Design a protein around this ligand. Sequence first.
Ligand SMILES: Nc1ncnc2c1ncn2[C@@H]1O[C@H](COP(=O)(O)OP(=O)(O)OP(O)(O)=S)[C@@H](O)[C@H]1O
Ligand SMILES: Nc1ncnc2c1ncn2[C@@H]1O[C@H](COP(=O)(O)OP(=O)(O)OP(O)(O)=S)[C@@H](O)[C@H]1O
Ligand SMILES: Nc1ncnc2c1ncn2[C@@H]1O[C@H](COP(=O)(O)OP(=O)(O)O)[C@@H](O)[C@H]1O
Ligand SMILES: [Mg+2]
Ligand SMILES: [Mg+2]
Ligand SMILES: [Mg+2]
Lengths: 580, 189, 11
Amino acid sequence: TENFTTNLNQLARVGGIDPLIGREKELERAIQVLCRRRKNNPLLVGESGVGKTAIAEGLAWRIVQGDVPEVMADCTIYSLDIGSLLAGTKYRGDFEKRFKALLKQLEQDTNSILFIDEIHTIIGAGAASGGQVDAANLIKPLLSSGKIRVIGSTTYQEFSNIFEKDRALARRFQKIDITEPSIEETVQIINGLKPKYEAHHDVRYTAKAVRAAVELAVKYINDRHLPDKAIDVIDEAGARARLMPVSKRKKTVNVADIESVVARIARIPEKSVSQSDRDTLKNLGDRLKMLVFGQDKAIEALTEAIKMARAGLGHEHKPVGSFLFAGPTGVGKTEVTVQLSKALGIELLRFDMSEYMERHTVSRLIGAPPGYVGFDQGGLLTDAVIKHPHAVLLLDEIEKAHPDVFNILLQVMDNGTLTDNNGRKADFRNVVLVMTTNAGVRETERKSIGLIHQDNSTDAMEEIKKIFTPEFRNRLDNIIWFDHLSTDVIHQVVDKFIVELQVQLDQKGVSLEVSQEARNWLAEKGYDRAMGARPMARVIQDNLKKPLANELLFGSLVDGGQVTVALDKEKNELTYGFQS
Amino acid sequence: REKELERAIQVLCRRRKNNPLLVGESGVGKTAIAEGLAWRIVQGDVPEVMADCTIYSLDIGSLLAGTKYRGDFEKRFKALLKQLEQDTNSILFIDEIHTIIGAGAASGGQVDAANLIKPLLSSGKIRVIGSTTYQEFSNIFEKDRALARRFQKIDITEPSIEETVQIINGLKPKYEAHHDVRYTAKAVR
Amino acid sequence: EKVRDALKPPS
Ligand SMILES: Nc1ncnc2c1ncn2[C@@H]1O[C@H](COP(=O)(O)OP(=O)(O)OP(O)(O)=S)[C@@H](O)[C@H]1O
Ligand SMILES: Nc1ncnc2c1ncn2[C@@H]1O[C@H](COP(=O)(O)OP(=O)(O)OP(O)(O)=S)[C@@H](O)[C@H]1O
Ligand SMILES: Nc1ncnc2c1ncn2[C@@H]1O[C@H](COP(=O)(O)OP(=O)(O)O)[C@@H](O)[C@H]1O
Ligand SMILES: [Mg+2]
Ligand SMILES: [Mg+2]
Ligand SMILES: [Mg+2]
């Protein structure tokens, strides 16, 4: 029978179980419940990682040191193993024999206590072919009688949905709700456990490192409770140091190592940015300007907002940024966002809001459609953010989306979190939200039927106000109005489109060199203010790609290149010369 | 895959909850990373602490099959833990770990493989290298917050074009011998 | 499923 039950008090003598710190009120109630003449069976109900298994085992630990009342002294605690109890019980009566034999020794001792971890498993432990004979029905008369004392442990999900379904078994137990300790209490717990973790990794943890692990975990590590969250960062930090090369090995765990661990656990950038990343931010704006010509104000808003986040000046309850890039066509509202992801090397979450025109399809970002029993549930936007917390979230053509989509982004832009239907929470604190719309292009473009031309370019904002609710616009960090491309800007665009063409030709081995005068001709021919810079692509396609297409497939341009493009002033037309 | 592995060695060198989970998409090398860790040990391309370690690949299908009894599953599964508990260096590679959360053997009960390994994983007795997809990680896994706590997710991202050509060059001898062909360097790119 | 079998020893 000893194979099924492990004496926890023995482990305490050799140090098998870690010490329990605090929990004076939680533990005290357990003693009161155990002392009870009747129904002396406490139940430790709490979320995962809140010390449910450290209290029952910690009680045994306290007994060895004599830090418990005289009544609790001289009382051993046994931990039951359901797996061993149900091992090789094929024949009828085997399980009952093992279970009843255990209960008999407990009643005889009169000072023994049983600890059943994950007690939700005894409901149907011994049921066979629909049989109702289970550990719960067997133990029941011994709990109601009060002969034996049993300590339980189960999560709220399991307790409410499985353990509390049997209204008889639950009556016998006494739920002791355990609440996660405060930040102040958690650091004390780490100090108590720090000697064991320090010995295992042969490292020393600075007092500042302990406080940082707790404070940083809450700030960044979500979906896990504080005692586990902090111990996870501490244990992982020690391993990182122990296994790195002996040369440059550092026994002490400075506060900087803690920050690096939290970053990898949460997949976010680390605090106290390094010199290498500092160079990226210094030249982040100047790199985008090379790719995107004009509209520097937009780049200044994105880069400055990112710097604040990486400098510790963030909102702490909102995303890195929320910018509504409202502007005319072909002004670089989407190019800057696609290049930003490349510049920062972070995943680009691109959502085309043209699809989400009606409410039935808007429930795909936070949940699954009704009746979708398929296991592939979850929102498209919540799952994506969870996979990549550091990323760029682009919602193109946000105006086309049903107005109800603006209500979803309110919490994202104010609280920084969006919850899935299942209850999972996504953190937007590191995502650069960017929206692109053409709400006011027509209004400003609109001509005025009057003797005096109207002072346009003001009504554009008034149209944006009508499309977007005031609450949505208040949360926004800045509404960037993209201006129209000028003649000088278009010249740079032609260069940008020629470089891309050169790259395509480089794959085939062809080399292209456009005369500077010829580039000016292309720019003037295609320059359109209303159509932005997209027409420049078309003139590049008609003037250059169309003639070369026939030559590449057949002719001198099969390989070798040696192209020489120039224009004729007399004819105002291009001259293409290929010599392999 | 030294950046991903290094993280896994850190998790496997922990006092408690030393069970690295290789979460990722489908086809991004989740299984190879775990089986690769064994290949690297044989050649001595791993730290000293990781040396003298064996990786066991669990087969839930074979284990569950043939039970036909109340305690057959528990008997064979518990015996496996004794082997892993006695051998401190033994590591268990449970591929498609999402399956253990669902009742493996139990029917109308909660005595599953997941609820049996939780006590051992919490105390650091045995290490477990799990592998699961992102869709399975969200909807099958993470529904039992207790088990998810024991496992430290290690996101595995798709490799770049340049990184993959190195991979093909590494695996080119295996396919060359099987097909008796020679893949040109330009062809793989 | 989980069925209990009663064995019979030889006489
Ligand atoms: N007061 C505490 N003193 C010491 N360690 C604690 C304390 N509270 C929690 N822990 C830590 O909590 C872990 C043990 O798990 P618990 O917090 O007891 O949760 P649990 O019983 O495993 O929860 P499940 O898995 O949901 S049944 C170890 O890392 C303990 O050190
Ligand atoms: N300011 C700019 N600088 C450089 N290229 C630009 C600029 N504006 C537009 N382009 C070019 O326009 C191409 C296609 O149009 P986009 O820039 O994606 O359009 P947009 O600014 O998102 O506006 P919509 O969506 O068409 S109303 C890009 O690939 C760029 O090459
Ligand atoms: N670094 C790598 N070295 C060798 N093979 C790799 C590597 N990364 C990925 N692979 C290949 O990826 C495949 C592994 O697929 P896997 O992730 O197990 O699929 P699934 O997610 O469907 O279970 C194999 O073909 C394996 O060789
Ligand atoms: Mg527990
Ligand atoms: Mg666009
Ligand atoms: Mg696989």
